[PDB]
Every structure is written in C-alpha cells, then in structure tokens.
Symmetry: C5
Amino acid sequence: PMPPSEFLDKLMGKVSGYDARIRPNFKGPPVNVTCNIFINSFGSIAETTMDYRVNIFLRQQWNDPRLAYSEYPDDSLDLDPSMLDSIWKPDLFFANEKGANFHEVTTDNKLLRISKNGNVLYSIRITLVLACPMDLKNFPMDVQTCIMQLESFGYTMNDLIFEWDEKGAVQVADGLTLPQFILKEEKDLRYCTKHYNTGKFTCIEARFHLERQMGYYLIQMYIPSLLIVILSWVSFWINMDAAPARVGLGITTVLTMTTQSSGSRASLPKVSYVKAIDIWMAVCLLFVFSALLEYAAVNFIARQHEMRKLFISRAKRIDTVSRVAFPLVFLIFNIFYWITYKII
Amino acid sequence: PMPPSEFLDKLMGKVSGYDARIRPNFKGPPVNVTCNIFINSFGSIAETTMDYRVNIFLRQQWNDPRLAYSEYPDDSLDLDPSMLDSIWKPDLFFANEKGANFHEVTTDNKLLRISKNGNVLYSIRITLVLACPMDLKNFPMDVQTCIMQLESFGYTMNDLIFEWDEKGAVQVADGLTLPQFILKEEKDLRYCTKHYNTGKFTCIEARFHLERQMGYYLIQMYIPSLLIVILSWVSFWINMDAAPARVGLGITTVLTMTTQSSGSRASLPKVSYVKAIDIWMAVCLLFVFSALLEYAAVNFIARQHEMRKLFISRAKRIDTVSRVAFPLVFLIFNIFYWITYKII
Amino acid sequence: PMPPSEFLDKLMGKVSGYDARIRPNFKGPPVNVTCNIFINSFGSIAETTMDYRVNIFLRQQWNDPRLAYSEYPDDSLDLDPSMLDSIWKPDLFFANEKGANFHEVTTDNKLLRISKNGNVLYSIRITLVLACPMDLKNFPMDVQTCIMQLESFGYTMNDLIFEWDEKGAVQVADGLTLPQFILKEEKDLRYCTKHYNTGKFTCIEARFHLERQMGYYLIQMYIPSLLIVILSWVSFWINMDAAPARVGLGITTVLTMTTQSSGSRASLPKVSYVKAIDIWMAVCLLFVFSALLEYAAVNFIARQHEMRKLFISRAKRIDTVSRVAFPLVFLIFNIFYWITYKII
Amino acid sequence: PMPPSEFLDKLMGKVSGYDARIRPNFKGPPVNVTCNIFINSFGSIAETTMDYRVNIFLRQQWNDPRLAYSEYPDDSLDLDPSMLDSIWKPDLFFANEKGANFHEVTTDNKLLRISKNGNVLYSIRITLVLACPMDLKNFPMDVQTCIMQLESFGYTMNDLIFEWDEKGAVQVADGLTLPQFILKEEKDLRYCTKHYNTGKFTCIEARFHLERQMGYYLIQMYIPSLLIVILSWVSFWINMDAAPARVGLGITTVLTMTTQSSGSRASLPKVSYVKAIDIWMAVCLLFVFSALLEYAAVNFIARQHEMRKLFISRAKRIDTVSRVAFPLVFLIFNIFYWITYKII
Amino acid sequence: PMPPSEFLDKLMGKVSGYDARIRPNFKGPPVNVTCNIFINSFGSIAETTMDYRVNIFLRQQWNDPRLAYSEYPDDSLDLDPSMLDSIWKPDLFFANEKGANFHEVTTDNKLLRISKNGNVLYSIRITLVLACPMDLKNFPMDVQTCIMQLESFGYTMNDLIFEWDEKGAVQVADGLTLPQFILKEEKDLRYCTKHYNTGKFTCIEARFHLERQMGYYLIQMYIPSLLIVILSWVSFWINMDAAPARVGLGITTVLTMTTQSSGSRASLPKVSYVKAIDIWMAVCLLFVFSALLEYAAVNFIARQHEMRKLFISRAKRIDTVSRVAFPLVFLIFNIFYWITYKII
Ligand SMILES: *[C@@H]1O[C@H](CO)[C@@H](O[C@@H]2O[C@H](CO)[C@@H](O)[C@H](O)[C@H]2NC(C)=O)[C@H](O)[C@H]1NC(C)=O
Ligand SMILES: *[C@@H]1O[C@H](CO)[C@@H](O[C@@H]2O[C@H](CO)[C@@H](O)[C@H](O)[C@H]2NC(C)=O)[C@H](O)[C@H]1NC(C)=O
Ligand SMILES: *[C@@H]1O[C@H](CO)[C@@H](O[C@@H]2O[C@H](CO)[C@@H](O)[C@H](O)[C@H]2NC(C)=O)[C@H](O)[C@H]1NC(C)=O
Ligand SMILES: *[C@@H]1O[C@H](CO)[C@@H](O[C@@H]2O[C@H](CO)[C@@H](O)[C@H](O)[C@H]2NC(C)=O)[C@H](O)[C@H]1NC(C)=O
Ligand SMILES: *[C@@H]1O[C@H](CO)[C@@H](O[C@@H]2O[C@H](CO)[C@@H](O)[C@H](O)[C@H]2NC(C)=O)[C@H](O)[C@H]1NC(C)=O
C-alpha cells in the first residue's frame, strides 16, 4: 500500500473537500476538546513581579469526522510537524500569558496523531510566564494559590467547548521539587467562562497551592531578631554607674533592629497592608526601644538629690522587676504570635 | 450552500475586484474607525525607567461596503487568522510604544468577523510597555497620570479618523488590582491630533489615574525616621556628667538618619527638584543634628570656671527648656507637614 | 480610472523596465538623499554602559525619475508597506547602532508616497540604542555630547550622498523632558565622511548637548558630606578630659565619610582619572581625618609631666586656634571649588 | 560526471520516491540513532535560578538505506544547509531545555554528509540553558551533579532508539575550565526511558560532576568570621574596671557576625534546610554571644557588697578559666567540623 | 548595454550552470579565503560572565572563476543584498560565539562586489559576545588577553583555508577608547587549526591585549585601606588610662577593614586562588588587628600589682617602640609589594 504521508495527502487535498479553516461538525453541535497538561518544570516564582514560569506539555483531543479512514490498515497516522498548517486546530490561549513561546530546537516540538474514528491527539511543548496575584497578609505562613486558565480566542461557547479529561487532568513530573515552596497534590479544576461584548467564550482552569517553607525565614530573620532582644536584656545585669555600658548597649541594639527590618522587605512587593513579618519586626523593635527607656528612668531617678539612699533603692527596685518582667512579656507574646499564625 | 471559507474567497478574489491596499469609501468620505480596549493585566510600573507594562485587547470596528453580502444566509463570517493578510485593516500604532509585541501561542491571537452590512470587527491581543512621565513633587502623596495614545501612521485626517465608542470605551478586568497603586474608575478620553510636516494624523488617547498606597512608605521610612528623632530626645534625661552617654547617643542617631535618607532614594529617578519625602528626611535630620548641638552648648557652659554654681544652674536651665521645646517643635511640624500634603 | 494600487503595479512591473536593484540616475550623477529625524522619546542614558536609547522617525527624500507619472490625475500615491520590497531605497544605517529594531505592531510602521515628479518620501519608526563616550572629568558639572551618525553601507560617495534638509533637520517632540538632563536647543549638524579600504562612504551626523541637573547630587552627596565635616567641628567645643567623647566623635565621622565616598561611585564607569566629585570627597575626608589628628596633638601635650599648668595652657591654645581655623579653611576651599567648576 | 548537488537532487526528488516525512526502515525494525556531544563552553551556573548554560556540538548518526548510492564515484556527499529540509532527521530534544537556540551567523551552523552505504552524519551547534536541582546540604563542600537528557518527541521506542556511541560519547574542549567548579573526567552515561499516556519514548542522558573550589569561601567567609571570634577573646585580657572597654568590644563583635551571616546567603536559593555554612555562622555566633555573657557574670559578681575581697577573687577566677576554656572549645569544634565535612 | 542587475542574472541563472551549493575550484585545489576585521565598538567586558561584546565589519575575499566576465565594460558589479542567497559564500563562524546576531535595520547590512577576474569581496556587520578566560592572579596589575577565532564549520582543510591578509588584518576605529582598559597596538595573528573526529578544519585567530587602568582601584580600595591603617596608628599617641579611647579606636578600624575587604570582591568571579588585591587587604587587615593586640599587651602589663612604677615604665617602653616600628614595617611592605607587581 501507499505510505501514510501520501495517504494523508489524499485525506487533506483538494479532493474530498477538506478545509483547515472550518471546524468539525460545522453547522451542528459544538466541538468538545478535552485537555490535560504535564508540568515538566515549575518555579522561579518572582514575588515583586508576581509571576511564575512553567514548562508544560499541552495535550488536546477532539474528534474530526472528516478524518475517519478505513482503507489504510493500521490504526494511527502521525502527521509530520511541517504539515500541521493544513488541518483544523483549536485556538487555545492562556488568559494570563505575560509572554510565552514555543520550543523549536532540532524539530518543532509538536506531535499529532489521528485514529481511525477521527480522534486527533495534539501535544505541544510550551513555556509560560504566568501571572498570579500574591496575597501576603501572613507572609512566611501563607498558602499561595497561583492558577492558569485556558480560553478560546475566536470560537464562542456554541462552537467550541473546553473540558478537562477525567483521567488525570494535571500530571506533574516525578522529581519536581521547589526551593521555596511545596506543591500540594490536590489541584482544583473548575470553569472560568468569560463574557465579553463579543460573545461568551469557553475557559477551564487549574489551581495550584504553594505552601512555603518555614526553615529559611527562621534562619535569616526570626532567630537573629530574637537574639538582639536578648542582647538588650543583658543591660539589666550591668551596673548602673557604668553609664556608657548600659547606654552603649541600648544605642546599638535599637539601630540594628532598624537594619534587620529594612532588610526584611528587600525582595518583596511594596504592599500597603501590614504582614506577619512586619508585626514581628515592630514588636521586637518595641522591646529594644523600651530597654533604653528603662535606663532613662534609672538615670533620672538615681540622679535625684536620706534623699540619697532612698532613690537609689527605688532605682534598684525598677531593675529587679525588669529582669523578670521583660522576658516574661516577650514569652507571652511568642505564645500569642505563633498560635495566631498556626490557627490560620 | 458552499461553506463560509469558500464563500469568503469569492468575496476577496480577483473576481469582484477587491483589493487589500485600498481603503473603504475611496475617493470619498474618510473611514470612521471606532475603538475600545480591554485591560487584562496592568502593572510593573517602573519609576526609574518611567514606563509601565499593560496587556490589552484592541477592538476596532469600521465599515467596508465592498464586504456586504446577501446570498449567504447567516449573519456573520469569521475570517481565519491565516487569511488576515488579504483585507484592509487600519494602521493603528501607539505613539509611546517603547517596544511591543503580539501573542502568537497555539494560534495568532487575532479575531475578525464581518456582518452582512459590511461591519468588520477586529480584535487582537497586544502587550505594550508604554512610556509616561512621572511628576514626583510630592512623592508618596501623588496621583500619577500615565496615558496611552493610538495614532494613524500612514493615513491622514481626510482619509481615516479614530473615535472611541460611546459604549464603554475602556473596560478593565474584574480582579485587576495593583500592589503599589489603585486605578480610579473615571478615565479621561480626549483627542490628541498630531501635526507634522507630512500631514495631520488622527489620534485618540485615554488617561489613567494611579493614586498610590500610603501604607508601605509609612512602615519603611516615616515611622523608623520618627523613632530615631525620639531616640535623640532621651539624651536630655541622661546626666550631664555622663559625657560618652550623651555624645555617644548624639553621634549614632545623626548618622543613621544619613543612612535612612540614602536608602530613601534607592529606587527612584535622579530628579533635581526636592520632593515631599526629601523635605521629611531633611527636617528630621535637622532635629537629630540639633540634639547634639544642644550638648555642645551644655558642655561649653558647664565647663566655665560663685562662678561654679552659677553656670551649672544655667546649663540646667537649657535642659529643662529643651525637654519641652523639641517635642513641641516636632509636633507642630507634623501639623504643618501632613496638612500641606493632604490639601494638595 | 483604475485605482492607485493597480496604477502603481504598472509603474513597477516587468513592463516599463523598473528594477528595484538599480539606483536612480544610474551611470550618471549621484543620488541626493535628504534626511531629517523626529525624536519621539529620549533617555535611559546609562553611564556604565555608555549608551542611550532613542526613538525616532527617520524621513528620507530622494528623486526617482523612473517614477514620474502624468496619466493619473492626483498628486501623490501612497505605496502600501507590504509592497515596499519592490522599489529602490537607500541603505542607510547607523555607525554606532549597538542594537536596533523596527516597530511592527498592528502594521509595519512604514510610510512611502510618490509625487508626480518622482519625489519619494520614506518615513519609518526606529528604536536605537546608540553608543556615546562619556567625558567625566567634572562629573556633576559636565555637558555630555552624545551623537548619532547616518552612513551608507554599500554605495560610495560617487553614487549616493546624504544631506540634512535646510528646513528643520532635527525636530524634537513637545513634551520631551529628561529626568537627569536637559537637551539644548542648538544641535550641531556636520559631516562625518568615512574612508575605508573599500571606498569612501557618505555620512551625516547630529550632536546633542546634555547638560545635567545639579539638584540631585546636592541632596545625596554634597550636603550630607558637608554636615559630617560640621559634625567633626563640634569636637572642639567638648572638654578635653572627656576622652571617649572627642575620640568617639572623631572615629565615627572619619569612617562614615569612607562610606559616603564608596557610595559616591556606585553607578559609574570605572574611569582612571579623578573627577570633580572625587576631589570633593577627598578634601572633605581630609578635614575629618585632621579633626582626629588635632586631638592626638591635644592628648599628647596635655599628658606631659609649673610643668603641669604650662602645657595645659598650651593645649588650650591649640583649641582656640582650631575653632577659628578649620571653618575658615573649609570656607575658602568652597570658594576655590565652586568657582573652578563654574568657570569651566 | 554531474556535480554532487545535482546528483543528490535525483536522490531526493519525486523520482525514486524519497519522502522526508517517513523514517528509514519503515514498517520494520526501529531506527538506531547513535549520538555524542562536544562541550565547547560551560558555565554561568546560577544557583538561585538552578540552571547552567552550555554550548555543544550535537552529532547524530543513523542509516538511511534509501540514500545508498553507487553510481557517483566518491565516498561522501555534503548536503548544503539550505537543503536540509528535504531529508529525514530525528526529532531529538532536551527534556530540561528552559530555553535554547541555534547559531545562525554567516551560515546556519549545520552539517550533514552521506556515505555510500547510507550512513548519515548530522552535526549542529546548540546553546542550551539546562535545568538542574541543587542539593546544598553541605554547601561549600558539595559535589553538584547536573545532567542533560536527550529524548524523542514524536517517535516511540518501537520506531526510534537513541544510543550513545562507544567511542567517546562526551568530549570536552581542551582549555575548558570553570571559575567556581571543576569538571570530573568520569561521566555517567545511562538510560532515562520515559513513560507517558501517549507511549514510551527513548531517552539517554549524561551526568556531570562539579566539585567546587574551597579557596573562595575561605577568604570571604571562613577566615573573617574566625577573626571576629578571636576579636572577642581579647576582652578577657582587658581590666574589669574598664567597663566600656569590655562591653564595647562585646557589643560590636556580636553584631558584625550578624552582618557576616546576612551576607553569607546573599547569592543563594532560599532553601529551608540548614547547610554547612549555616552551622558555621551559628556556632561562631554562639562564641561571640557568650563572650558578652561572660562579662555579665563578671559585672554581677564583682558588684556584690571580707565580702569585698571575696567576690573580686571569685570574678578573677572566672576570667582565668575563660582565657583557657574558650579557645579550647573553639579548637575542638574545628576538629569536629572539618572532619565531618571531609569524611562526607 | 543591459543593466548590471540583469547581466548578473545571466551569470547566476540556469544557463551557464552556476550552482550556489558548490565551492569554486571544485575537485581541485582548496579555496583560499583571505579575511580582515574592523572593530567599530569594543567593551562591556564583564568579568563575572567572562565575556566581552564587540562590533566588527567582517571582510572576506575569495576567487570564484565561474564569475569571471568580459562582455560588460565596467570593473565591478555590486550584488544586491536580497540576491545574496544565490552565490557561494564561506561558512565562517566563531568558535567562542556565546550568542551573536546580524544588523538588519533599514537594509540588511551586507555588501558584495565582483571584479572582472572573479574576485569576490563580501563585508558584513556582526555583533559578537565573545568568551574569554580571565587570569586574575594579579588583578589590578594584569594584562588580559581575550581572543577571537574564525573557523570553518562544514568544509575541511582540503577544501577551504582561511588566511589573514598581509595588509592590515585588524583595523581599529579611530576614537575607540575603553573606560577600564587600553588596547595595545600589537595584535598577535596566529593559526588555531582544529582536529575533530569529523575531519580537520581551518581556523585563524587574533589576540587582543587589554592592560588595565591603575587609577580607579587606587581611589576606591588602595588609598582608603591605607588611611584606616594610619587611623590605627594614632592609638599610640593616646593616653593609656583612656581605656575606651584606645580600645574604641581599635574596635572600629579592624571591622571597617572587613567591610572594605568584603566590598573589594563585589564585582568579581569567585576564583579560588588568591589575587594581588587579596594579599593587600589581608596584610592591611593584619596591621589593624595587631594594633589592638598591642593594647592587650599594654593593659595586661600596666595592671600588674616598686612593682607599680616598674611595669608602668615597661608598658611605656612597648609604646615608644611601636610608634617607630609599625610605620616602619608598613613602609617596607609597600616596597616589597609594589616592586613585586611592577617586575611582573
Ligand atoms: C459536546 O458535549 C456536550 C455534552 O456532552 C453535548 O451536548 C449535549 O449532548 C446531548 C446528547 O448529544 C444532548 O441531549 C444535549 O441537548 C446537548 N446539550 C447540552 C447543553 O447538554 C454535545 O452533543 C457534544 N457535541 C459533540 C460533537 O460531541
Ligand atoms: C465619518 O464621520 C464624520 C462624522 O460623522 C462624517 O463627516 C460628516 O458627515 C455629515 C453627514 O454625512 C456631513 O454633514 C459633514 O459635512 C461631514 N463632515 C464633518 C467635518 O462634520 C463622515 O460622513 C463619516 N464618514 C463615513 C464613511 O461614515
Ligand atoms: C546632487 O548634489 C550635487 C550638489 O548639488 C550635484 O553635484 C553638482 O551639480 C552641479 C550642477 O548639476 C555641477 O555644476 C557640479 O559639477 C556637481 N558636482 C559637485 C562636486 O559640485 C549633483 O548634480 C546632484 N545630483 C542630482 C541627481 O541631483
Ligand atoms: C537497532 O538496534 C537493536 C539492537 O541492536 C536491534 O534489535 C535487535 O536486533 C537483533 C538482530 O537484528 C535481533 O535478534 C533482536 O531480536 C532485535 N531486538 C532486541 C530487543 O534485541 C535492531 O535490529 C536494530 N535495528 C536496525 C535497523 O539496525
Ligand atoms: C591556496 O593556497 C595555497 C598556498 O598558496 C596553494 O597551495 C600550494 O600552491 C602551490 C602552487 O600552486 C603548490 O606548489 C603547492 O603544492 C600547494 N600546496 C601546499 C601545501 O603548499 C593553493 O594552490 C592555493 N589554491 C588556490 C585555488 O589558489
């Protein structure tokens, strides 16, 4: 028999009246395209830009009854990617593209095969830089949901309908891990049907849940800010007459916490609302700012001028309380802080 | 009947004399193109570069009387995006492009449909990086107006006229929020008709008002600069004989305010005029620079050599005034500062 | 009559012998192309990279006597930008391109029209990233001259000659302002004719003068460096017996000036020669380095061991002179500094 | 005889029935493509992005029995790179591309030659930016394995099989050195055969082992952090009555180690787990944080109020122990640290 | 006579049997291509990336005896750049490309002319980003040699041979200066013939010597590090009883030298070996680290407890020696340092 590249020329030629500009089942029911993706790579989730780069295999399946054959004996005909400009393909796009491209190295990374009953599989490799909004109300303790949605650009709902297939609509590669996040196994698959002044267009989307990793932000921000608070607590065990010792400790710790807070938001969007790392670096700034205000009460009362042995005993009393009080208030703040951002 | 891709070949072929290089109503009245956009994405408003990236759907509508049909029974004919190089389309462009591109993934994201009376809708997806000048005279308290304008490149006013449509000339997507800005709902739609030595060309434009968000700049700059001013005020409650205590406080606060002011303009254009954050960081620098000049008056008068008990009582007098004076002057500055940048 | 797109096919076809590979007036006098540009955008003048991005309209006018018509009644024929590959156009390029591109969004932004006597106007929109050398001998006080030059790549001087037109050879858009510079209205238009081993080629160029803005560099560098010098002057009003007060002031100011000088050259090319901001940050470093060397003369003479009451009166004498001397030397330096970089 | 470009037209023409859309040995055994690469350049191994750029020559060899010739006398026919779109080539791609491109300057950098028995060599130049996961559990002491894998996109295992050749499957250029790494000479060549819902596809891969260089991280991080620990040890040789001397040393060293640790992770991914440089900068932070806690035990016991001469002799005892103890504990930590990250 | 674009069609047509896929002198001696470049721009020499961007005119000359003409009277025929796909051109490429592109603005910047004896000149404009390894053993005092090499991709040595022409093989533009380097006038022109498993291929290369500029690195690094060493020398002129004065000077200078050394390698590759700026910043760190170890010997001996007047006179002796010793050791280090990196 004649080879499949020549048999498939007679199935697309001027004979038999095939036209690549006309959808299947024309002037009839709409075209039911069923889709699933395969995430090869994932990551580079920039939070200033609020986008993320992904690398997928987009598989599409529809039924073209004009491509049904019975003369050729075998069961599938792979169409060459040079000849893909000659059959009908759906005009899928991404409603949050922000730039995308094809992979064309050593061959156009495209694939198409046609069954005997006209079922057409069409798999392509796409790199996307998808946009997603970042809710950062509790920034190291959040679950970021970044989505991707697949619309039709030119065919309306009465012509072309997208669906996810019921057999694994999103697969993920095996060794796909992320440096800052983890990807939860449940993926929300729902509809996102759009309405414009043109018509109404089909849309399907898939949610991805990205829980962060606590372990990085503990090392850089939570633990060193917790040591500077303890570094202000050793002022109370220093003699009151050593005036540049207790002041010189209180000067430096209250201005390194300003440095630790200025570097806390170096790689973030400039959001207006206050986030959970900002309510840590402000309360921890409040303890080291009050550790120098304690000595301003010591140095004012102990300099009052028996009137001498009274106020020195009173300024001794404010130091015996503050050695017990300030680690007790910082301890009950950590109880109210970490429980609040674990219950949420 | 014959399918619409073959009917529309007879409407564009050598028969009937259609030519894609000739405007409609040729040697007659000009072509009235009516336009509206649909902002999908918005943002990445860089202020050093003074540009902003947007992602729109550009819809254009005109009337080509050579495309009026009556034989084919239905009411609209979608032209395939491979065959868009064969009818007349307006040569719209953006007068402040700074780079732009099309979206061509899985299909050229283009759309065209023709009514029975020759009305041609033409919608395309464009990514723009539009230039806009930044007026930063009151930088955290400003309303930035960045525009976009749509000109004709080759047809003059007596051939082609752009208009906004009266039914929603700029729509914005539903969940379109910005991290640093808010987009006001009123959009100024006016004309921008250009005059060159070639001819005069049509132009329409749309203003977008971007009020900022106060909440970010309070956390990073206004509040920590306000604490260092209070950190210089606790010098007055420290004994005068503790010379490295009052000097060592005044040294450090006056040089961290130089650090807080150098980081205040890290992500800005290098504008010449003074802005509202620069008149904050200079007056707040003036208080901490005068808090060390106060002790230079203390340490000079208290070292004069009853002549002993006189000048110590005089140097005590300058400290009792300055504990009341300096928070009173900083309080009446905040009244004159925030009212001035709220009335404007 | 037949429409202009069909009339102009007969003027470019195989009939009448038109050939797009042959210059006008062939085997005769050279082709006189007259040019002018129109600067839409200007800026992003990077000084590390030593380049600047511009966005122009390049208009070219020449006379092709093979395009003279008299049958068609009207006076200009706009050629469609799809058909621009069929007439002769000059091979202009930029001798300092460093990358450039066309604008092709919604139409190739090109324009061509032909008069009855064969005059051909040809306007295109180009984005350029032009290279220019930066003379930075007096860096905030300089006038940077960055040019652009327009050569012929394949035709020599005996075939093709470029000229500027005498009627406004460089226009600038109305609202074109720069954040760091101002553009002077006089533009030097001169010839730049090149000689190679191939032949000699035509060239025209245009100089642009970019005077800077003083106001930015005063706020970030000149004023805060001037306050740290005054911050070292308050050491002389502090008692000599307060040894960590006068030393602790002199330590910190001499090492923040090293920080202010290291940040003074953060966004600059690594030029070898010394510039006017470097001779400011070195003399201002010399005052704060001598303010601690003054106390090293105080603390050595006042510790000599009537021999006691003599050297204390001598160390008092070196402080009464230096309270008058050091602001007097810094005042006469500012006279010699700002006059030198105003006369130049 | 006729020249080889005309002889090879008769071997690819409509005569003899050659078709570039049909694999060799069709309806028979699969195609055995044998491959080897040649690494020209290597490097720019970004660790935040977790990728690396490489520049290779990809050679492929297969046997097409339809290209066997015997009339033409010579032994190889170089096909011109303009005519490479007319014979069958394998659809190899890289499963971890992350962007790639061809080299097309002065000629498409492609090469193909055909032997008399139909052996087809096909060498091309490709630039790849390959993705690889970074295991950073022991960050300056690790061996990073970054791979590259070569799959088939459209042909399954029963049609096309990739193999490495047994004669030097990966060559490396002679002067190919790396700034941060060394490339080990043994390269693991194994199979990576993929299974999808489409079919099963061939895959071969090559592992590259990149041992780092110790010498950079010693200079920037290990040695200066080791000097600040010694800088805290000289507190014990300073008198106890010099209260701003021993405190003022302990303040500054414990907050420069926070600076040295914040800069230790400036160019890294934000991994959660703790790495070997993080357990250095935390133990070295523990010594300088305990060097100030030692004086808090000195300044509390020496201020107790023979009761005077007792506790001063006891506070002398805690200083004689700590001059021997703290360099002894830091010495036995370096034994347990460097042996642990040398045995692994 | 017929015009040259039509005469040259008969010299490339199906008549006369010209074929653009066959080299000149086929089945004969190899093709002797002679080459020379013309450097327009040079620079952006990134040292982290270890590459440099250049902009050249690549001229190639060979002899095609099939292009010899005698009927047409004139002496050169310029081929239009649209018709360059129809004659034979060498497949030159760059063995260290790392990305390159053509210049195609307003015309493809290409040029070809044919003499009567068949000599073909072919000049094109190319932008290259060429890779070169950086030897940084003596980093501010080095001569960097970065090369560029021009190979053949498809023709072996028995088919095509590259040569430099003997008349100025590398010209440089007149005003071509560099911000960080100077380009020496002698350029080493040698052969680089490659051997692969395919065949042996021709190669020619050109070395460029880039001596740096000393003047930048003196201002930022050598001079401010030399002032901090002098800033530690003024400790010896301060009284021994002023304990926070001599310690507080020694604390700050030894930790700003760590800052000056951390910023010394901010824009460098992470090389393992020690370089000449690293042996400066380590010896200068050794002087300021020993200036605080000197007072640790003072404060231990002067606190020993005639036994009182003995050790104070001994601690006075260690200060009289160190005022002479430490500037004498730093002076003889500068003799051994600058002579060593001037003799090399
Ligand atoms: C595409 O999918 C939908 C859902 O299966 C089909 O639409 C329905 O099909 C059934 C039976 O054919 C009808 O009873 C319904 O009236 C149809 N409409 C709705 C809204 O449910 C449709 O037939 C499918 N089209 C093709 C070509 O397969
Ligand atoms: C395009 O729009 C303008 C405005 O509607 C039209 O120009 C005017 O049309 C009316 C009636 O046709 C005339 O009375 C005016 O003299 C026209 N000119 C001006 C300046 O107002 C124009 O007719 C429209 N052209 C088309 C093809 O619709
Ligand atoms: C192009 O411009 C130049 C200058 O106008 C012309 O060259 C001169 O033309 C005049 C009169 O035609 C002659 O007297 C001169 O001898 C010409 N040469 C020089 C060097 O001055 C030239 O004619 C113009 N060519 C065209 C086609 O317009
Ligand atoms: C491609 O490679 C494989 C391995 O050499 C070949 O497959 C085997 O070939 C031998 C002999 O031809 C048979 O005994 C085996 O049954 C084959 N299959 C397996 C799984 O081992 C194959 O013949 C080669 N094909 C070509 C065209 O060379
Ligand atoms: C290309 O260049 C080389 C060197 O000039 C030529 O090769 C030699 O040419 C001379 C005389 O023609 C012979 O004596 C030698 O035997 C040749 N080979 C060698 C290795 O020296 C060659 O002829 C030139 N080819 C062309 C077409 O000009």
